[PDB]
Amino acid sequence: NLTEKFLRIFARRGKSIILAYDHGIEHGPADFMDNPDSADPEYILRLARDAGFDGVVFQRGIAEKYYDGSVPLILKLNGKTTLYNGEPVSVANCSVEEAVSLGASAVGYTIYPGSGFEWKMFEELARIKRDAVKFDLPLVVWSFPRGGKVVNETAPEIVAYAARIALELGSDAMKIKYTGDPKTFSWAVKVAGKVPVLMSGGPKTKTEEDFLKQVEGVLEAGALGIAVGRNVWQRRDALKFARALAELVYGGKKL
Amino acid sequence: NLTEKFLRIFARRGKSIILAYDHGIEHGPADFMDNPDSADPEYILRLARDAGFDGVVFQRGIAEKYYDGSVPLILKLNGKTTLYNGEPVSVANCSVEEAVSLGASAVGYTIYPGSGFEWKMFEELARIKRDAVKFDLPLVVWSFPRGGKVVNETAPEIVAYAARIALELGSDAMKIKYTGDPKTFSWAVKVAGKVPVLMSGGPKTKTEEDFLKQVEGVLEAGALGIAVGRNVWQRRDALKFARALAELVY
Amino acid sequence: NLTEKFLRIFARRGKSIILAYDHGIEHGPADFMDNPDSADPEYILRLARDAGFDGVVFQRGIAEKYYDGSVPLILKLNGKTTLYNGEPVSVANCSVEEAVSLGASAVGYTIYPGSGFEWKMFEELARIKRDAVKFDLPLVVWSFPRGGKVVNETAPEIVAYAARIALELGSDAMKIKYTGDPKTFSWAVKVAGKVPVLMSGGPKTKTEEDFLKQVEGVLEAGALGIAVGRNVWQRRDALKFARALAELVY
Amino acid sequence: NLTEKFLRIFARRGKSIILAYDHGIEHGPADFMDNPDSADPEYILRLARDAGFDGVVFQRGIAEKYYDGSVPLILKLNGKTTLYNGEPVSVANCSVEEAVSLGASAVGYTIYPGSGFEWKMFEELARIKRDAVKFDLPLVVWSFPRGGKVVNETAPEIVAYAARIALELGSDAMKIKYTGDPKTFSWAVKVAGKVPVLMSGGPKTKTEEDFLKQVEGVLEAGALGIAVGRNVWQRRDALKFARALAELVYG
Amino acid sequence: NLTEKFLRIFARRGKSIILAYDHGIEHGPADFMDNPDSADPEYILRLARDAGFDGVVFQRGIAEKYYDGSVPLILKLNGKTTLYNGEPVSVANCSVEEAVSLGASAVGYTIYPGSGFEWKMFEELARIKRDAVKFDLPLVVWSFPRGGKVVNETAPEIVAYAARIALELGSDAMKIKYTGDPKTFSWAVKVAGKVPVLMSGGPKTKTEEDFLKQVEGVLEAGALGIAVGRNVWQRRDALKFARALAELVY
Ligand SMILES: *[C@@](O)(COP(=O)(O)O)[C@@H](O)[C@H](O)[C@H](O)COP(=O)(O)O
Ligand SMILES: *[C@@](O)(COP(=O)(O)O)[C@@H](O)[C@H](O)[C@H](O)COP(=O)(O)O
Ligand SMILES: *[C@@](O)(COP(=O)(O)O)[C@@H](O)[C@H](O)[C@H](O)COP(=O)(O)O
Ligand SMILES: *[C@@](O)(COP(=O)(O)O)[C@@H](O)[C@H](O)[C@H](O)COP(=O)(O)O
Ligand SMILES: *[C@@](O)(COP(=O)(O)O)[C@@H](O)[C@H](O)[C@H](O)COP(=O)(O)O
């Protein structure tokens, strides 16, 4: 059971915080100017360690050149850029077998349900899923409806759809966008059934409190925890704030 | 003879009811709000068993996480979403070999004849068909003409075309839309020949009576049975009504 | 030599009549309304056998469920529908190896020279040709230019082009549309060289005499014979007229 | 060295004449009406043999039904039609391995640099080049820029680009369009470096002398010779003219 | 560690100059009219040697016919032409295995982030990267964002994105456009992390002084060196200028 393996490794305390760092490809280095140290993957590793987080997410080139075994690794297999203008598509730049050699404990893959290319991502995910089972690595799906009829990616019915698709396609854990409230987000958590849900952190919030309140909602809705990037490492007080998130998520008490 | 195998497993009583549950990918969870328990695959398995139905239809993720061997399984290999706006296409997210591993007794695959992508699904069905034969699992084709010249999907000449295409491409059973009346639907059944036909249940009908009436015509047209989702599990009295369907069909 | 093999099997008398029956996918069951018995592949086989024809053409599904070894079989590997609106393209739904297992004595494949997808069909035909040689099964190509700059499919220069292309790509026999007269048709036969040409029967003619006259022209042009569907089995006197065709051709 | 092998087989006399016959697919049989025997591949083989030419170019269907080993064969692996209206593309209908079994002494492949589909041909040529090396058959590239920014295919800078691309991609010999004069054609020959250049014959010229003058310019430019189709087999005096071409190129 | 192997071979003095010569395909022979000896690859090899440069970049055809082992070789695996009008795309015409056989000490590949085809190059670079590791050849990525939203290829944010993408995808060294000043270029150098950066030379500058100032700024920004073509071999005094470059860099 790969969900069980995922939980043992990335959620030993009953909840999970994953430090996300595929941003160098997805958005590029404009994400790193706020807190320049954030451009250094070594800083990101020390940050995940010192904050007591469960994992990091790296693309293959970052894992190859920097990964040191110090925090469990989710190797994000596919990536695209924001420079790209077509219907959304993100293709694997790494195999599951290569992810094993690079020290990963899980693999990650983004799908964009609704895209004119949804078929292209589903077809490749099928091959990656088969390899995840073969190599006994949990498959984590970033499920981000985009393109086609999608006009509001955080609408309740869009996020619930995102969650259900990830279940249906064989994910062992998933990452979806937050709806902005616990009632509608708990519907997504429910339809995902036995597969645990991680909240995608999103653009840096106006205040730290705004983020903490979102995280409380996610936990209220019954999600497993968060896969957070900017709302930690785009902050000059990254470590102090990361520590406050750890206490909220692992501590389990009402703000 | 994989048709014979299909009949032995899924129509031991001479007729067949299959509980369809690929909707979580095809339509998403809005389908589940009318009767919230329907979002739980375990509730679906209990419903199929408790009504004495012949099979269930699951995508790979649902089968992997929930399938317990209690009712025969058709593993639906391809899925698409309603969020998608292109020429209709649905590609495999699972192989026949993996379906075998997940405990499937048959595999399912949707084609959309007429789509700008009709060639992509025919190409893929060729490989899936070859594998179905290799692993001795019946191949059940959902034949749903869509895109291209198709305007009315339930028009009698489209449904009959759907039936013929499924026969021609090598299906061992098929699922097609109802035309709304037994005489026109019996032509589709006729052109399917040796291959048994299941009626796609469709959107929940205004009254329970309306649906029973449709199932009556389906059987009268000589079809094998029904592959039904919403018209059972979107109802709050799902189990009671499923038992009434079992009484009618068998 | 696979042309020689094709002639021994399908032209033992020196000329050939092939009963074509891929219509179920290509046009759908509308083709069967004229003579409803034609929806039944058992009736088609009986018809070919009774009239003394040389072969039958089935898609894989029909061959698998109905072929009984009674008449030599050309397995038509690719198929498309009339519901489809893009640039013309027909992909294989069956392999040469599978066709051999289905009892085929030859394999068939349609190309649409000129189509925006001509590259896709030429690519796939290369694989099929390779397998046809490997399995020693003659390759029969339906060469039907369509799409691109093709305005009139029965223009003398289009049909001759269709014939040359089938020869160049490595067909062992070919099926092409008739130009309407023997003089221009004989140019198409000439440019096909050593590869025998079968006339595509086309839409059912206004009279049985019209068709007989076309067939007479085809023979005068030096063609091997005919691959006929509708002009036989769309007729209520199917057997009688098939026998008059045997008379004329043999 | 496959260029050296190509030269030994197809240019033993120092220059080369190859009789090209892929027209039946590229242009269709209207090319054959002027001289109806030209529709008969047996006639083409006899023509090349009787004129003393170095080779013939056939698509797989023609080689399979007709090739008799009598003249060295270049197996033209890809073909497209003039009925096709999309971005110029021509895909292989035959593998290198099959070409070997059909008697080929070399393989041929057309690319259309500039096409919206140039990537599809480069990707395929890569596989064919790998197989050519594997089976030790020289690879002859018809480098015909077409589509994209290409307007006049015989413009000096286009023909030179065609020549250089064929060198860069790994051709062992190449066939390109003539610019219409020896000075500009010689720059194309130079940028091709160690790879020998054959002139594509083109549409039948107004007079025989017109074509002879073009050939003289091609030879003046330092090209290896000509890959000629229509300017021979479209003529009712095909063999007579073929022998005059042999005298010019080999004398 | 393929970056350390790249550095040992192509940067033994601590900084690198690579003589780039993929122009014959990328731009065609118009690049060669200024200094026509530049059309001869033997002239190019002698130049690199005489100038004391670290390496040369050839496409497979040039390497196969001309490479003599005299200077270390980066085999540039993909190439496209300026004649092409679609969304930028450049596919492999050579495999890593073949590059090994041709005497390559490294392999090169261009990506165009932002292109409507960026996915096609990412998919292919993945197979190339896997082979580079298997054959122990460093992978050098030319990262040139182009198409999509890209309007100024030398903008600070675009060149930094270029650099970071090359690091993310697995390059062992990279080649990127210069931003025109050392401050903005050093940010691209920093985001590349452990992966060394080479400056793409670009079109021939108005004066020798102009190019020298740019090279000075490239070094000031902490880059490894330059991969230069036109700014050396388009000049009549190619060798004199090449040695002035060697004096500055080393
Ligand atoms: C990237 O942020 C890309 O997401 P989109 O910008 O395309 O919506 C994600 O793949 C991250 O892995 C994930 O969202 C967590 O990072 P964040 O900074 O949002 O917390
Ligand atoms: C889904 O209903 C999808 O069908 P369309 O909405 O694309 O026409 C089918 O794949 C079902 O498996 C089948 O129709 C039976 O379920 P229903 O709820 O229609 O009875
Ligand atoms: C189908 O008739 C399809 O032909 P098109 O409608 O696309 O032109 C052919 O593949 C038949 O196999 C062949 O033409 C012979 O049948 P016919 O009914 O025309 O005699
Ligand atoms: C065909 O002529 C096709 O060329 P395009 O009409 O597409 O330019 C070539 O492949 C010939 O092999 C070559 O041009 C030699 O024949 P020609 O008749 O031109 O002398
Ligand atoms: C070619 O110059 C292609 O570059 P673009 O014209 O597409 O931007 C490069 O691949 C060169 O290899 C590299 O830029 C070095 O050559 P240069 O002449 O620019 O110094």
Distances (CA, A) of E56 to E53, E78, E214: 8, 16, 21
Report the b/e string of C83-113 with b at 16+ CB within 10 A: bbebbbbbbbbbbbebbbebebbbbbbbbbb
First to last CA, chain C: 24
Structure token digits, residue C48: 């070919």
Give the count of alpha carbons within 13 A of D153, CB side only.
14
Query: Which residues are paired to E141 by β-bridges?
Result: E109, E174
Q: Is the dihedral of CA C122, C124, C130, C134 positive or negative?
A: negative
Q: Which two tokens stand for residue D195?
A: 């790879």
B92 touches chain A (CB under 8 A): yes
Query: What letters, b where the CB count within 10 A reaches 16 and e where it falls short, cover A214-241?
Result: bbbbbbebebbbbbbbbbbbbbeebeeb
Rounded Cα gap, residues C3 and D204, in angstroms: 34
Q: Range of A254's domain? A: 1-255
User: Hunting for tokens 């033994």 — which residue is that?
Assistant: E12
Resolution in A: 1.9
User: Could you say which ligand is closest to the alpha carbon of residue C84?
Assistant: 3
Tell me if chain C has a CB within 8 Å of the CB of B86. Answer: no
Six-digit token pair at E202? 């670009």
Place of tokens 């197979």: E127
CB distance C58 to C75 below 8 Å: yes
Whole-angstrom CA distances from E216 to E7, E56, E197 are 20, 21, 14
Least Cα distance to B163 among B174, B152, B153, B154 occurs for B174
Which amino acid does the sequence have at B145? Answer: P
- Bridge partners (DSSP) listed for residue A141: A109, A174
Alpha carbon of D87 to those of D90, D112, E84: distances in Å?
10, 9, 11
Tell me how many domains chain E contains.
1
Q: How many angstroms separate the CA atoms of A140 and E208, rounded?
A: 54
Is E123 near chain A, with CB under 8 Å? yes
Collapsing DSSP states into helix, strand and coil, what is residue B236?
A: coil
Q: Which residues line ligand 3 (CB under 6 A)?
A: C 20, 22-23, 26, 57, 142, 144, 200-202, 227-231
Give residue B94's identity as a one-letter amino acid code.
C
* Cβ neighbours of residue E215 closer than 8 Å, sequence gap 6 or more: E199, E226, E245, E248, E249
* Amino acid at residue number A141: V
Q: Which residues of B touch A147 (CB under 8 A)?
A: 85
Assign A97 to helix, strand or coil. Answer: helix
E115 touches chain A (CB under 8 A): yes
Residue E161 CA neighbour count, 13 Å, CB half: 27
**What are residue D223's phi and psi, to 5 degrees?**
-70, 155
Please report the atom of ligand 3 found closest to the CA of residue C234. 18
Indicate the DSSP class of residue A3.
Answer: H
Phi first, then psi, for residue D123 (nearest 5°) are -60, -45
Residue of E nearest to D194 (CA): E65
β partners of residue E200: E227
Distance between Cα B38 and ligand 2 center (Å): 15
Contact A28 E123 (CB under 8 A): no
Torsion of CA C24, C25, C29, C35, to 10 degrees: -30
The catalytic site residues of C sit at: 175
CB contact under 8 A, A168 and B79: yes
Looking at the CA of residue B110, tell me the nearest atom of ligand 2. 10
Strand (E) or helix (H) holding B87: none
| Spatial separation of the C-alpha atoms in residues D216 and D245, rounded to whole Å | 10
Sort residue D144 into left (φ over 0), alpha (ψ -120 to 50) or beta.
Answer: beta
Residue D207 makes CB contacts below 8 A (sequence gap 6+) with none
**Cα–Cα dist E31/D164, whole Å:** 12
Residue B88's CATH number? 3.20.20.70
Q: How many CA atoms lie within 13 A of B8 on its CB side?
A: 8
By C-alpha distance, the chain C residue nearest D120 is C119
Contact C86 B114 (CB under 8 A): no
Angle at A174 between CA A170 and CA A177, to 5 degrees: 135
Query: Whole-angstrom Cα distance, residue A188 to residue D76?
Result: 58
Q: How far is the CA of A88 from the centre of ligand 1 (A)?
A: 14
| Among C26, C59, C204, residue to substitute to test ligand 3 (most atoms within 8 Å of Cβ) | C26
State how far the Cα of D153 lies from the Cα of A148, in Å rounded to an integer.
42
**Cα–Cα distance measured from residue C197 to residue C191, given in angstroms and rounded to the nearest whole number:** 10
Cα–Cα–Cα angle for A140, A144, A145, rounded to 5 degrees: 135
Chain C residue with the nearest C-alpha to that of B149: C83
The string of DSSP letters for C171-225 reads -SEEEE---SSHHHHHHHHHHTTTS-EEEE--SPPSSHHHHHHHHHHHHHTT--E
Q: Across the interface, do E25 and D165 touch by the CB < 8 Å criterion?
A: yes
CA–centroid distance, D96 to ligand 3, in Å, is 34
CA angle A20, A26, A29 (to 5 degrees): 85
Decide: B91 and A122 in contact? Cβ < 8 Å.
yes
Rounded to the nearest 10 degrees, what angle do helices E156-169 and E118-135 cross at?
50
Record the tokens describing residue B154, joined without a space: 């339930």
State how far the Cα of E28 lies from the Cα of D176, in Å rounded to an integer.
15
Q: Whose CA is closest to E225, among E28, E12, E4?
A: E12
Cα E133 from Cα E96, distance rounded (Å): 10
Residues in chain E: 250
Tokens of A75: 């190797």
| Cβ within 8 Å, pair C149-D82 | yes
Record the tokens describing residue E62, joined without a space.
């040039």
How far are the Cα atoms of B152, B193, B216 from residue B158, in angstroms, in the given order? Answer: 8, 17, 21
Are E177 and E144 in contact by the 8 Å Cβ rule? The answer is: yes
d(CA A228, CA A20): 5
Task: Quote the distance between the C-alpha of residue D182 and its chain's center.
Answer: 19
Q: CA nearest D209: which of D247, D185, D244?
A: D244
* Cβ–Cβ < 8 Å for A126, B92: yes
CA distances from E223 to A36, B232, D75 (A): 19, 67, 50
Q: Quote the CA–CA distance of B67 and B74 in Å, as a whole number.
A: 11
In D, minimum Cα distance to C160 occurs at D29
Among chain D residues, the shortest Cα distance to C168 is held by: D61
H/E stretch holding C152 reads none
> How far apart are alpha carbons C139 and C127 in whole angstroms?
12
For the beta carbon of residue B182, count every other beta carbon within 10 angstroms. Answer: 18
> Is E141's Cβ below 8 Å from some Cβ in A?
no
Q: Do the beta carbons of residue D111 and residue D125 sit within 8 Å?
A: yes
- Do A232 and A47 form a contact (C-beta atoms < 8 A)? yes
Question: Of E80, E128, E88, D113, which Cα lies nearest the Cα of A86?
Answer: E88
Non-local (6+) Cβ contacts of E16 within 8 A are: E10, E54, E55, E196, E198, E224, E225, E226, E249
Q: Which residues pair with A74 in a beta bridge?
A: A57, A106
Q: Which residues contact C50 (CB under 8 A, 6 or more apart)?
A: C239, C242
Element (H or E) spanning B75, and its range?
strand B73-76
DSSP assignments along E71-132, one per residue:
S-EEEE-EE--TT--SS---EESS-HHHHHHTT-SEEEEEE-TTSTTHHHHHHHHHHHHHHH
Please report which helix (H) or strand (E) contains residue E221, including its range: none
Name every protein residue with a CB atom under 6 angstroms from any ligand 2 atom: B 20, 22-23, 26, 57, 142, 144, 200-202, 227-231
* Residue D223 per-residue DSSP state: -
Residue D227 near ligand 4, beta carbon < 6 Å: yes
Please state the length of chain D.
251
Q: Give the separation between CA E11 and CA A129, rounded to whole angstroms.
A: 42
Whole-number Cα distances in Å, D217 to D142, D222, E144: 20, 9, 42
Partner-chain residue, chosen from A40, A81, A89, that has the shortest CB–CB distance to E165: A81
Asked if C176 and C159 touch (Cβ cutoff 8 Å), the reply is yes
CA–CA gap between residue C222 and residue C197 (Å, rounded): 8
Q: Which residues contact D86 (CB under 8 A, 6 or more apart)?
A: C116, C148, D116, D117
Residue C31: strand, helix, or coil: helix
Distance from C-alpha of B219 to C-alpha of B158, rounded to nearest angstrom: 20
B105 Cα distance to chain centroid: 14
List the structure tokens of D211: 């074509």
- Residue whose entry in the numeric block shows the structure tokens 């379906």: B99
Query: What's the one-letter identity of residue D22?
Result: D
What's the CA gap between D204 and D234, in Å, rounded? 7
DSSP state of A204: P
Q: Which whole-number Å values give the CA distances from A82 to A26, A29, A234, in the listed order?
A: 6, 12, 18
Among residues D143, D69, D59, which one has the least CA distance to residue D105? D69
Neighbours of B221 (CB within 10 A): 21
Is residue E29 less than 8 Å (CB to CB) from chain D?
yes
Q: Does E141 touch chain D (CB under 8 A)?
A: no
Count of Cβ atoms closer than 10 Å to residue C181 Cβ: 13
Contact C28, C81 (CB under 8 A): yes
Q: Which residues 6+ apart lie within 8 Å of E55 measured at CB?
A: E9, E10, E16, E18, E19, E48, E71, E72, E73, E74, E105, E106
Catalytic one of E15, E175, E177, E204:
E175
- Distance from chain centroid for Cα C65: 21
Tokens 């690079």 correspond to A102
- Ligand 4 centroid to Cα of residue D200, in Å, is 6
Torsions phi, psi of C43, nearest 5? -70, -35
CA distances from residue B16 to B53, B54, B141, B177, E128 in whole angstroms, order as listed: 8, 6, 16, 16, 52
CA distance A252 to C80: 60
Cβ-in-10-Å burial (0-12, 13-18, 19+) of E239 comes to: middle
- The pair of three-digit structure tokens given for residue E171, joined into one six-digit string: 């390059």
End-to-end CA separation in angstroms for chain E: 24
* Region for residue B228 given its phi and psi (left: phi exceeds 0; alpha: psi -120 to 50; beta: otherwise): beta
Q: What distance in Å separates the CA atoms of residue A254 and residue C220, rounded to the nearest whole number?
A: 94
- Check CB contact under 8 Å for D84 and C3: no
Q: Identify whether the C-beta of residue B14 lies closer than 8 Å to the C-beta of residue B54.
A: no
**Centroid of ligand 3 to alpha carbon of C69 (angstroms):** 23
The dihedral built from the CA positions of residue A199, A201, A206 and A211, taken in this order, carries a sign that is positive
A230: nearest Cα among A32, A75, A74: A32
The alpha-carbon gap from A29 to the nearest alpha carbon of chain E, in Å, equals 6
3-state SS of B99-110 is HHHCCCCEEEEE
CA atoms within 13 A on the CB side of D248: 21
Nearest ligand 1 atom to the CA of A142 is 10
From D200, D234, D249, the mutation candidate for ligand 4 (largest count of ligand atoms within 8 A of CB) is D200
Q: Which atom of ligand 1 is found nearest the CA of A110?
A: 10
B208 CB-contact burial (10 Å; exposed 0-12 / middle 13-18 / buried 19+): middle
Q: Are D53 and D247 in contact (CB under 8 A)?
A: no
What number of CA atoms fall less than 13 Å from residue B65's CA on the CB side? 25
* Two tokens, residue B175: 């699922």
Phi first, then psi, for residue D158 (nearest 5°) are -75, -45
Q: E71: closest CA among E14, E22, E141, E10?
A: E10
Torsion angle of the four alpha carbons D41, D47, D50, D51, in this order, in degrees rounded to the nearest 10: -140
CB C128 within 8 A of CB D94: no
Residue B124 Cα, ligand 5 centroid: separation in angstroms?
41
Alpha helices in chain E (DSSP H): 2-10, 23-26, 41-51, 60-66, 96-101, 118-135, 156-169, 182-191, 208-220, 230-233, 238-249
Give chain B's radius of gyration (CA, Å): 16
- Partner-chain residue, chosen from A115, A130, A167, that has the shortest CB–CB distance to B24: A167
